[PDB]
């Protein structure tokens, strides 16, 4: 029913349980991995993914939603391997991760045939495997809403309307890209409560975060641990005021953690200073205790982690 | 010794014979092929590759150099799946094909580690195999010499100095990119005679082409058949003019034909409108017969197709 799972039968939605809405098992650039496999260690990548997932499960995580898509090196056979090693509910997705331009394949190509690529993964299966896509992922950043970025957004809208699956975004918090995504999707007949505007926790600006929640979409305070974007205690006080002002029905939090990340901007040796305590369980060690002893009940955390994902996927 | 071949041991520069300097067996965007295999037909594109190669060998071609590199879907296994089916000498290369920016992997990574990737392909092998890269391919287009394009050119300079392999370039003929690649490469210690400046046959401007040749580099009259850039009759005029001005010591002629391309601007159905007679044998059907009946003799085309490829790889 409703939500498709990797290496397991489809489950209902209400059966989602405690959910981490935004985590990565591994991300890489497709071109460079395909051309130079000597840069990578698949055993190290598998060992880290398994170890990180199992510890999340120990804290009571039932389901992880992994928005790794084209441009981030989505591998469904890798996803199966860790599912079997772990017993996690894994929700894979479809979509395109870009900041500026599409690959040359998409030259002179219609929004429609891009949407057909998403609708394919949702209905037929990812990479010819039978594991179906449960959501669609789109990105936007500092370069803003470009021609090719918009085409991916409008393609996501069509896939949403025709398969009823929700859409998760990557955005820049300081840009207005998050708001623009919401606007363009809604205009094309997308129910606001089916959109998660991501990386909104990268900013102090509660007013900007609020209006996106007011327009009716889930807000992504989803990069806990990544201190370079915003430190943990800055994020803690932002989520706290949002909960106090009654936005907990729109709040979704995660880590955006990568057990293995490809980019030279984020190699393991830069971890201290940039993101010293960044893991897939950081919110259990810091955020959740902090909120509990600051006057938030566990009905609120059940909203954010259980009820909100449930409404998102139905 | 000297030139490494795909699944064919290795031969001297003297044994290269009649050569096509710039032809593609199949190009595709690495990311979309990895993410959506349903868009592709492995068997058909293999059949297209073999049919064209056999037809090329029939007409007298001994060696084909294929500058499919990162960004164009270099697959060493597909290449050796052909060859075995044909018996063609095939020179594979290394490098990066970009017009603007590198994939995220390269975010704040040095020119030296980009060079190491090219050096790995030449000295160690390509994609986990023992087949080696005999040259390095770099690119530039309408966006000009950007920041990341500069990096790859400089990494190519290091790989050449280290390994003695020559450099094949892609350039835009109407914006000085070819001259600029030559400038940077030679400044950085590369022998001008070891660079092929690509796609110079796309232009009417004869003064510009001579500019590159006078600085001692090979000139790429290498897109015969692609009428949308310049029709065959115009190219033949330019080719003959340079031959009669005595530039055949710098002239290299090819088709840039792809048996399979995934670019939406290069759909098979677009051929009769954009590049009607475009195939791997057009120079045997049009160019050479045109030249012969216009005065140019057997040693002049032997210089272009045997001797110049020999010098290049010496
Ligand atoms: Co993101
Ligand atoms: Co080219
Ligand atoms: Fe992410
Ligand atoms: Fe080419």
From Swiss-Prot, chains A, B:
What does UniProt note on temperature dependence for this protein? Thermostable.
Q: Which residues bind Co(2+)?
A: 137, 170, 199
**Catalyzed chemical reaction(s):** An aryl dialkyl phosphate + H2O = dialkyl phosphate + an aryl alcohol
What's the top EC group for this one?
hydrolase
**UniProt keyword annotation of Chaperone present:** no
Tell me which EC number(s) this protein carries: 3.1.8.1
Q: Which residues carry this modification: N6-carboxylysine?
A: 137
Q: Where are the transmembrane segments?
A: none
Q: How does activity depend on pH?
A: Optimum pH is 7.0-9.0.
Which GO molecular function annotation, any one, does this entry have? aryldialkylphosphatase activity
Q: How is its activity regulated?
A: Inactivated by EDTA and o-phenanthroline.
The record's comment on cofactor binding reads: Binds 1 Co(2+) ion per subunit.
What the entry lists under SUPFAM superfamilies is as follows: Metallo-dependent hydrolases
- What is the annotated role of this protein in its UniProt record? Has a low paraoxonase activity. Also active, but with a lower activity, against other organo-phosphorus insecticides such as Dursban, Coumaphos, pNP-butanoate or parathion.
Cite the record's note on assembly.
Answer: Homodimer.
Q: Can you name this protein?
A: Aryldialkylphosphatase
The lineage, from the top, is: Archaea, Thermoproteota, Thermoprotei, Sulfolobales, Sulfolobaceae
